[PDB]
């Protein structure tokens, strides 16, 4: 089937429905090819999302909705939220309230760098299998324990880049290699990026890591002259709407549910 999407849908309708196999998925939107019901993000297949859109398209709201979807699908022992918000976006991650779920929220660039590096080096790197092990030894290793870590990164274009005099690494760069290997350490990065400059957007290292990780990418409002791939062009769209594009090339028009 292929139905047309409403102007708006409440995220609470989406959550109450998913609630009612061996699922490892969250849902924060409805889809044209899902009979206007929830579109599950299968986290074993696509452990995160890259979200690309022009101003006003609903990048920030989508992360709020994803946060709320996480909290309704998982207990705090199963999932923790790390909130990265360099623009202190109005009505954004700063207002997502959940004690027990939020292990860190930061907006200051050095603070963000600290939070991401601590998570990557103290928590996630240990979950990787040690180097210099036989494949036989690797197959019998104990799996890591603890919660899955959902890192919500708004406005990656506003993260401070690498510099010299004084030397500083790009803010949050510690996470990039673990994002490629995210399926092994239970890391789930949902990052948004302004995409008015379609031509630099592929050079953004956050986009590179997510593409290299082969996560799905959500193309919200964009210039229809721009091409997602040989077969799919970007679309101009109202807020909350986007083209969900899998690494396999599958494409769905979706509508992000409006958060509580
Ligand atoms: N899922 C949605 N459904 C309906 N309307 C939405 C949705 N998300 C956002 N909007 C509308 O779009 C407006 C801007 O949303 P938001 O601030 O999330 O966009 P943004 O892309 O993060 O903006 P910016 O590019 O300025 O950071 C909201 O105030 C709301 O009016
Ligand atoms: Mg925003």
Author numbering: 1129 to 1148, 1152 to 1391
Question: Could you pull the original sentences from the published paper?
Answer:
To explain structure-function differences amongst EccC-ATPase3 domains, the crystal structures of Mtb ATPase3 from ESX-2, -3, -5 were determined at 2.20 Å, 1.97 Å and 2.00 Å resolution, respectively. Though the sequence identities are only 20%~30% amongst the four ATPase3 domains, their atomic structures can be superimposed and have r.m.s.d. values in the range 0.99~2.02 Å by comparing Cɑ atom pairs. Here, our structural data showed that the recognition pocket in each EccC-ATPase3 is different. The signal binding pocket of MtEccC3-ATPase3 is much wider than MtEccCb1-ATPase3; the pocket of MtEccC5-ATPase3 is much flatter while MtEccC2-ATPase3 has a shallow recognition pocket. The different shapes and compositions of signal recognition pockets further imply that different T7SS subtypes could specifically recognize individual substrates.
